[PDB]
Amino acid sequence: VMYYGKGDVFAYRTYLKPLTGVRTIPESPFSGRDHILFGVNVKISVGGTKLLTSFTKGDNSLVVATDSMKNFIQKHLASYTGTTIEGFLEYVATSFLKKYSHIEKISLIGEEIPFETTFAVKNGNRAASELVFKKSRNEYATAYLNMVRNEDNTLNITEQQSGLAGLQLIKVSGNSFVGFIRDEYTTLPEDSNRPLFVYLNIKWKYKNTEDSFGTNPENYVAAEQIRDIATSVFHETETLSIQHLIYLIGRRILERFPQLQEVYFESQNHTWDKIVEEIPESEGKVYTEPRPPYGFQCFTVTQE
Amino acid sequence: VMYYGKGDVFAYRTYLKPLTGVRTIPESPFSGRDHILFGVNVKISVGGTKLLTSFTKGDNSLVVATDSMKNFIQKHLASYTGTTIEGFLEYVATSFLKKYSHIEKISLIGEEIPFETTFAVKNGNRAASELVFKKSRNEYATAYLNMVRNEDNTLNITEQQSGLAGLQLIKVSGNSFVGFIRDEYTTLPEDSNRPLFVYLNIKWKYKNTEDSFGTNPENYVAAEQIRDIATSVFHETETLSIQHLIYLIGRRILERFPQLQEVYFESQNHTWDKIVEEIPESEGKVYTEPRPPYGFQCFTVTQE
Amino acid sequence: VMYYGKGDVFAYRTYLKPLTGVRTIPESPFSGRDHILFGVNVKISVGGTKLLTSFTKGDNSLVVATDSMKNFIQKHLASYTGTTIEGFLEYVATSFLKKYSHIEKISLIGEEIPFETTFAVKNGNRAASELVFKKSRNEYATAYLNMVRNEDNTLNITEQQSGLAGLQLIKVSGNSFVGFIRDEYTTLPEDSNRPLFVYLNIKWKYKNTEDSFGTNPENYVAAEQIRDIATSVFHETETLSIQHLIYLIGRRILERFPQLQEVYFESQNHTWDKIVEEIPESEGKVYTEPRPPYGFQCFTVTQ
Amino acid sequence: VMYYGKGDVFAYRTYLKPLTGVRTIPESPFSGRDHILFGVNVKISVGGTKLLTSFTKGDNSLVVATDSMKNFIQKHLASYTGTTIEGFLEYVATSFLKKYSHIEKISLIGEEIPFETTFAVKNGNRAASELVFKKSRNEYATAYLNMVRNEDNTLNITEQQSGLAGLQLIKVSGNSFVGFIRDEYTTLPEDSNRPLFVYLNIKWKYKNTEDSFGTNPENYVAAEQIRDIATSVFHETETLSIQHLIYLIGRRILERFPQLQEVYFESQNHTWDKIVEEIPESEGKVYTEPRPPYGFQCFTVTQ
């Protein structure tokens, strides 16, 4: 292996072109993005056979400084005329390979830095502010792109993936975990009604990479829509396990977005431990945080 | 000093009595709390002269185990019939001093563990779920209560404070920082239009402790309402500094809630560094994260 | 309350004057610091009645920018000719009040950013490198100082405290927790031999603030020495609780350092849950991490 | 992809069999581990075609609960008679596949939870305590293993890697970064003498997986030895970049350990920004923390 690059390249852009013209689904009100404020955290990795002597001999002649990669990304966010993180990565990648002909491969990650709207009173009414936003440390969209230079100096995308990370969902009832193996290693009781708490990271891959860019926005799959599918399916389903839930989420995603080829889940179980099972004159209960060990699941659903 | 206790006592309750009957303000739609899910992280500290030998001699005779304090808190969340974190702390404190007559002082912190609503489709329409909620790692309500046992075995509250913590607000324009001291230590340029990014922790104290409990909910001051005041005032104000902003927020809080005696702010400056000042054919700009050092302000506004 | 300032002012200096000739105690090999690399994270807070209009009116006329306070701290680390964090804070505080006559109060915290030695082969044998150091995320020294301007324009230190933060110690055996209250709320079993795991933050105050500066190193109390007292006392003591342990650590500190007036402890309990009590043909056991709730204690011992 | 498992399975064992008799290298004093306290954080992942319906149908008939995998790991730390994390993973993997015939693949990660010795006064002199240890949040050893069941029902290790994570090293002088591309995107100045601060994660693969287990300790490669090679090489080398440094560390590792097939590096640059270039009557400088963006390098050296 031989790569180098820059991580935590934060870049915040005001007044990116808005995303509109999207295709709606039943599970989501999502209709676009205003883009008054657009934040992204970028990681860039580059490789190429001609970088070998930068390691073996300390020869920096063909080294693009990682600080210069940071400048490149931040300057390109200023000149980007598109509407998605996916399209921003394509713009950076193509531009970088065109600039540096000795680079054979570039890999990019972009993570949304999300902001939410806030309320303000003016002119006699309360409305969402066009100026003041709230930083969110909850779920966020992601994008991944890898591009190569071939022998003829043409460029090709070699992998693209979009995602939603950091979704944390708890369903207070309507979940069971029963019927698992009971042997000399089993101390977990069967539970016909648990408050399942799952962390979800969901990633999708398009059949046609062009649909990821937003240039024809009706073919874009928005992380907001994926989020809303996940919450709807969790609500709708008497869950039998996390494994069962994520399969059903993935099936719904692929049904709503026929332009997707596959969806990949990384899930974790953070369900609370029960303290009080019955409260006089109430349907409530009390729970608390478990010990650190967490279950996890990794699963792909494909159109096939 | 001589105290001991338990921290990170997480407790999650389903179906707490809902908070309703609140008094509204122009800046906020807030109208109550459903309390389908109510999470709190509690810290308890206790003291008393009769605990001295637990330190000086290793005599545990009068030691309530900190693990038992955890049980006490979690069991009392199950039996709590009120509607606020403030009232929950009062219930725990009074109950604990009544149980343990050798304890002279108790201090409690409760921090909300907030959950947000999610969307689900059922019966032909999309609506907010009554079952599936999203864990929020953004701003959260707080409460503080200290109670003492006097010589006659009567109990008194000796300090109460409510709060909002973890609010992170960025205003993209309409903020200046000019006119500060320019001497041999000054390298900061004057800036007539910066994207001010502030972290806010806001705490308030009631004139009458009873109003904090929710028993007559029209006198309660909700953290949600305080949040919405903060965002409105930030939007409304051409800010001249963070100091200027927080004074104005505090004045608005005290005007809207005459039952409050004072409000206290801890603010931090996290404003981004500018990278690109002018973009062809756009009003946008690009910014990035600053170096670690952060400014901060601590300020009290009183009805007087 | 009316204050403002700057936090997370990191400042690293190479080749600070070495601290040498500190009086040793039996529990610790410490006698000084080479200061090839000296790192500190500073927080500065300032107040004064003349700052009122910066809040009430948005008037920045008397505002020293917090960015300028960062420059002030960093430049003063370059000009500091002393040997301790405590003395550096005094130098910053005195200098700032002398510079800015409208400021009536300054509070400073300094937190060591610690670096440990590493091995390098020099002339065929391993020795400590004089160039390569390892950044440590374990325990670190601390210092606090509050200085005011009086009505007669003299400057006065009103509060000083030094400390050791982030010490995490686990003693595998030789600890009990028995005899506590057993009532309706008690589920914890008594334990005559637990692997007590404590986090310790230890703070001390000097009788004479000048001793904190290091100018006469013989009277300086080093956080490294406090660390080694804590480990020695934990080892020597069949503990009966954390409360019992911290009292005994405090007494030993005050006995070793008669120039101190007080020692203050903030401790937390992080003892593991036992999973396997007996292993064939072994004295060992298996444990795991507990649920999140943690006990804590706060206690002052005075000289 | 179709896998599931358990993460953050902490397990602490007292009095694991000591690791002794490891062949030493010049850069390191390491020859063994006392194992009075042995901590590991384990992650387990399992797969098999017979798990399909647990996802597609909600059928838990063939689901080993992830909670039960936690019990399995913790009980096997109690019964483990060997001396290394690598060997513990092999024991868990073999045992799990032998127990659960429907599982075709198991992947394990083990991360050391390191504890350092402390001083106690014993018979009038400081010595290392045999009871009191300090939890370290610095560098730690790692191990990875993937084992499969073949069609003929033999079990086979398909991947093994050991490592050292979290090493943070700063060399105050004797580092340059010059000669890189200067074009429209370049603002970084050349620097002939920077205080290079690197984070290093170093991973190695053995030619013969058995050598990783420690059964013949003479062939075991200890993370402590890798650490000390890295510090020695950093000290000895006038570095020309991180890229140059990690290549040289890798070559030294492979020279010292002919039983290794490869070494893999993940490095990050955290070098401070210079604030004060010259201090009167001193060789020292002042630096501060940079903005967040960090450089990184990934590189394999092969035997």
Ligand SMILES: O=c1[nH]c(=O)c2nn[nH]c2[nH]1
């Ligand atoms: O949904 C779950 N899947 C599992 O595999 C599991 N194991 N323990 N609890 C569990 N819950």
Ligand SMILES: O=c1[nH]c(=O)c2nn[nH]c2[nH]1
């Ligand atoms: O609002 C601000 N207040 C300050 O005190 C300050 N100092 N630097 N920047 C600043 N911004």
Ligand SMILES: O=c1[nH]c(=O)c2nn[nH]c2[nH]1
């Ligand atoms: O040392 C201890 N002190 C306490 O107060 C306590 N409570 N539970 N366990 C404890 N251990």
Ligand SMILES: O=c1[nH]c(=O)c2nn[nH]c2[nH]1
């Ligand atoms: O050692 C370094 N390698 C790099 O690639 C680099 N880029 N900026 N600074 C750097 N330092």
Ligand SMILES: [K+]
């Ligand atoms: K819709």
Ligand SMILES: [K+]
């Ligand atoms: K309203």
